[PDB]
Design a protein around this ligand. Structure first.
Ligand SMILES: Nc1ncnc2c1ncn2[C@@H]1O[C@H](COP(=O)(O)OP(=O)(O)OP(=O)(O)O)[C@@H](O)[C@H]1O
Ligand SMILES: Nc1ncnc2c1ncn2[C@@H]1O[C@H](COP(=O)(O)OP(=O)(O)OP(=O)(O)O)[C@@H](O)[C@H]1O
Ligand SMILES: Nc1ncnc2c1ncn2[C@@H]1O[C@H](COP(=O)(O)OP(=O)(O)OP(=O)(O)O)[C@@H](O)[C@H]1O
Ligand SMILES: Nc1ncnc2c1ncn2[C@@H]1O[C@H](COP(=O)(O)OP(=O)(O)OP(=O)(O)O)[C@H](O)[C@H]1O
Lengths: 380, 382, 385, 386
């Protein structure tokens, strides 16, 4: 029996790698994906072999991530509950996609992940795992093992030679999320020094910095006149936005599984892209199209947040969003200053910006007012 | 014949006042509303009499503006095309509401306003005017007169004893908008020193300021523990927020009448209230209710923008938003710093947040059921 | 330990009554609700006492059913996936509501029901049970026991001496649903003679019958001039409509649990009420209000279908629907003829219809409206250059 | 100057043709489109010459109408205010399209139509024209002339020699609408003998008739096993459904321009197609996709009703609906009987229906977990209400 494990190299997945060998007497194949966590994925691939993996795979998926997940999601103008740019949500479908692919190539009947038994992550991983390969078997140790506490896990780890090292994290090219610990009290401001991807706004440059982003077809293709591949482009905007402390969010969100959770997110590059995209759309999109699109975005956002990426509903809405996005061509000019992003200019080859006279307006008014007058008259 | 005129005290409405008397051989009743334009409405009232009004009325409508228009709108989480807080839109229905009220009391058959014959304000004024009094007669001079140029209008003013004088503005308790002139080039950043209501972020305090806003029932009732009336509260948050340069928006918006226009808006108090409200809702509102509410907010925003305030659709939605907003009770703690507003804390008496009802096995069952239709889809695609 | 069982009186709930006693060795308070199944609930009550129940309650909830559940739902124009009028969905919440109330009075820690693990009902009972009393315990025998088939159950019943006997059904004041058995083949038409509430159109009167329904405030208050209570009014319309074979639906629906299911429903009075209301709304509701209401109807419908009646979302939407429904005051006239319902007329005290804007604006006005509405399209074409 | 007129062949457009000559002294190019009005369009074309047209064009547009307008609209499940299948609405865009095309080829400066100045049709004609040719000039005689009353127009007509004579009609392959006259009172039942496309339920066959419709990719492609082109298929279904009195609607609808209006519609083929399509969708469409599609249908419907066919919003929605419709492949079996259409069966090569999941991999215990997770927020809510 073989099992493909989503291995990140941490303590837990290392413990899980041992547990799987022991518990299922199976051969474990480790898979580590580089999606911009800023760690040396090769060190994880090696540590997996040291921990007992019968094979360790490590792939650079940054380009695929941005191009096939982040970009399509951004085209939809997806925002969860007013602020969340969904950094963790769009990433999971990618990992799971590869776990299933690898499992098929290696002839493995099962895949495994170390997402906890009470969070949303497990749902995200498995929803796409089941959607891509319906008969795959999933093993989620956090739902099957008996461990009573951390102390016992630490002890278990020491027993197996696994090296043991105030809040949880998750980082990738789109963002870094923080929760748990000091963050669990929604009335307590995040601690000083927690942020890693972005500079403290109070420590940001005293001079604002301008940046231009070009869109060709719904997708950003250049920064300050330099053409850049999808991953390279997000990276660049993370640097520029990060240096200024842009893209910070502090919310209490509604979980799909549990109840409410307090999360802090920094999405410098994506935050810039969000306003840059809308800046171009303000010249290129038709009014009614824009209004309909924005009324569908929230639905799309929750689908991504819940984990229904490879679900027919999300793909259906995507056809709509992509159709609209095809018109988004032009350049956005923004001004970055101490935590804030300001749209300062926009232009487009097919801008709709600058057919009737005043008498025309009077007629429009009269026709629009008719049902209101009748109603008023009827209220007698 | 009597005509009630929405008189602002400026050159154009003064010219309009003279124009109306002669053109219609009628007497004009001037009405000036104080909605926070930062002007002495009483001097406009006197100037009207001097300009020929048979009667001039000036009312302080700041409290009503915030209590009956701004708050109801904010409860709905209304935002037009991603950023516009509707500062100009919610103020028009209120002005027209009084014009029609005064016309009825004075026995006037018509009302008049000085909105341009080609813009959006005209629609706002008239849609509410007709909705409140179907038989009212509306006279929009800009759509009716023969003036062919600005210069001709000045000569007319000078001939009638009416005193004469980069972009145009509109200010009230919620915001100040800027449009036209140099702002007409969507690629050009607004000129230095244009903002009046908010300090430039570059000149804002080096020290961040924390502010707490209490919501009792969907509406903000206190700032930093101090109970404030609707207008006094909006005012207070404009002062606090303005000092930090909070609430600046630069957008090209879609108009109801013509095409697009580049507008710049500064809404310090409203911006703080926007995030504060959502902060309290994050603990008080149910997930499914929040999601449904946010999907209707845009529709509501466009109704307000287009001018359908006293319209049955807006009121039906308002019934929904008010039902939801009733649960928004609690306090939001925000941090202000150089142009930005950061939510740093929130609490509530009936918070649904328990940082802690089901076990791991439960989650697996949930996954299986949620995944069924997807698995069936996959097998069918073979 | 005490368990309150939603007891209907059939073989399954009877077996469950025995099973609960042997399995949990607790007292079982049986509860049978009269919601219009055309069944004598006292029989079930007594049959429950015989079967072992330590106590049996039988309540007449017809008026409550129609008044506090069917009516509010109808005000919203609720229709699931094009044709389902939610006959079974709005009933469950009512029952669950009483199960929890009873358990609270009897000091019972749990409630039980005989809905299967494959359906929506289990969700409806439980979602409302937990929403009304979070600490309640729910026992669903179909999900816990070992019976591997009909046969095993029949024997088990006889072992405990319990009376024993194509498709199964569910009936109440709103409709009768048929499902399973021969109905599982979506290509196969329901067998002839299956329907019970409606007469076969082929046997319906040769002369059309006209019926008038008065709505006062979003709810129907009279039929053909006779004022009738909510439950009484639904009954009358079932008789009138059933006679003509009105309201038959045959659909493959999507269950909340994940799979498709072939269902057949007959909702005579509801189908008449459905059209009667829209007919009155056509004169009393503003255009924009109507268009918004119709786009929200489907969401409300799935909420009810899934079991989220006592959920904040449904109640939030209800405030909107009730607000709009408040204006639905007037009368609808419909013609019933062999399975069909045709709206032939409608009137209302505050109708917005004036046969004069057809027989506050002129020709010139329309021209202007057209120019303003066309501007963005012309600019689009121009820019497409 | 040249003016391309949407000439229907009737009294009004005949008067208009004269009015255009006499008022604008323009060369009038008449255009009649056969979209299935059941009128020998060629007659109209000759009559236009007899009336003064310097050129008369008649085109058979049945196929284009169904394939490029009716089908795309049905693909979206478009229903205006619960009952209107938009028979008149989807036709206008097609006509205006040709009006504009003929104007360019003929080098004509303006186009004209005879929709009244009080209705929605004028909007439909013009939104389309302006959408395809922004520089086009439009002449709407009803909004420009001094005529007041049919008595007066009949005089002008007689004067010029144009032949002269309870409700107004409008027919095409999709339906026939009736409005005005004795129909204006919302409380009055329509008059016996009005309907033309459908047999009266009471006079319909005594035995029910079954019909099957196959959909391949969102569109109907065959009836009772016979492949049929878009126009021929609608025709066949009008014949079959008509004989049984199917597809009659009687509503008071909300107008875009006027206030409210009482309309009666008969759409036999369309009504069958509507229930057939949903029958095939019940097996081929995913639950969440269906629920989402149905919530958007009403918006698409008012877009069509208001005349925004060639508008960016409608085409954007169309992309959503076409994406969804692509999966609708299968056959629906319907029972026609005295005015009604009953769905009695449906099958599909890629049906998502699995009997094994409903009959007695799916594990009953999974439902409990599903239930508990779904119930959490409700329990917390109750507990907090304490
Ligand atoms: N405070 C107010 N009280 C009464 N009417 C007002 C007020 N503010 C605006 N209006 C009405 O709205 C129309 C004006 O717009 P805006 O406020 O954009 O006008 P202006 O051009 O700034 O002033 P003026 O008309 O004096 O030149 C006015 O002509 C007036 O009829
Ligand atoms: N009138 C009623 N009173 C109480 N509970 C009811 C009633 N009708 C249905 N129920 C509940 O819903 C569940 C039943 O469904 P249905 O009525 O579809 O079941 P059956 O399995 O067809 O009949 P039975 O349980 O009587 O053998 C029942 O097991 C019961 O717990
Ligand atoms: N088949 C067609 N070909 C060209 N234009 C048409 C056609 N059918 C309708 N129209 C246009 O739509 C307008 C008409 O509507 P309707 O058919 O409702 O008009 P009428 O005024 O009832 O008849 P008519 O004008 O022909 O006597 C017409 O005046 C005509 O310009
Ligand atoms: N880069 C990655 N490659 C493969 N799987 C990953 C990666 N990052 C996270 N996962 C998977 O996602 C889930 C984990 O989350 P998180 O990354 O929040 O876990 P941890 O518990 O923090 O990590 P670890 O146990 O590996 O130290 C499952 O553990 C883990 O298998």
């Amino acid at each position: 029996m073989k099992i493909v494990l989503a291995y990140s190299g941490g303590l837990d997945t290392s413990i899980i790698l041992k547990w799987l060998k022991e518990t299922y007497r199976a051969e474990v194949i480790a898979f580590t994906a580089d999606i911009g966590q800023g760690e040396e994925v090769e060190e994880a691939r090696e540590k997996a072999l040291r921990t007992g993996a019968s094979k360790a795979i490590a792939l650079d998926l940054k380009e695929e991530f941005v191009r096939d997940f982040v970009f399509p999601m951004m085209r939809a103008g997806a925002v969860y509950e007013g602020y969340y740019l969904l950094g963790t949500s769009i990433a999971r479908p990618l990992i799971a996609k590869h776990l299933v692919r690898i499992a098929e190539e290696e002839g493995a009947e099962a895949i495994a992940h170390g997402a906890t038994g009470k969070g949303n992550d497990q749902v995200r991983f498995e929803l796409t795992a089941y959607a891509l390969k319906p008969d795959i078997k999933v093993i989620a140790p956090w739902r099957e093992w008996s461990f009573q506490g951390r102390k016992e896990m630490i002890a278990y780890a020491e027993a197996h030679g696994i090296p043991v090292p105030p809040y949880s994290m998750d980082a990738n090219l789109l963002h870094i999320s923080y929760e748990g610990g000091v963050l669990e009290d929604p009335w307590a401001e995040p601690p000083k020094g927690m942020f890693r991807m972005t500079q403290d706004p109070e420590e940001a440059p005293d001079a604002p910095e301008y940046v231009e982003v070009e869109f060709f077809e719904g997708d950003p293709v250049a920064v300050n006149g330099e053409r850049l591949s999808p991953a390279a482009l997000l990276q660049r905007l993370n640097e520029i936005g990060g240096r200024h402390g842009v893209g910070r969010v502090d919310i209490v969100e509604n979980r799909f599984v549990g109840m409410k959770s307090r999360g802090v997110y920094e999405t410098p590059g994506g935050t810039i892209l969000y306003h840059a995209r809308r800046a171009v759309e303000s010249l290129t999109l038709d009014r009614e199209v824009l209004h309909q699109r924005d009324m569908l975005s929230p639905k799309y956002a929750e689908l991504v947040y819940y984990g229904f990426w490879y679900a027919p509903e999300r793909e259906a809405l995507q056809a709509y969003f992509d159709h609209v996005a095809r018109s988004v061509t032009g350049v956005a000019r923004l001004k970055l200053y101490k935590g804030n992003v300001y749209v300062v200019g926009r232009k487009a080859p097919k801008s709709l910006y600058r057919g009737y006279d005043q008498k025309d307006a009077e007629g429009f008014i009269k026709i629009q007012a008719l049902r209101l007058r009748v109603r008023a008259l009827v209220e007698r």
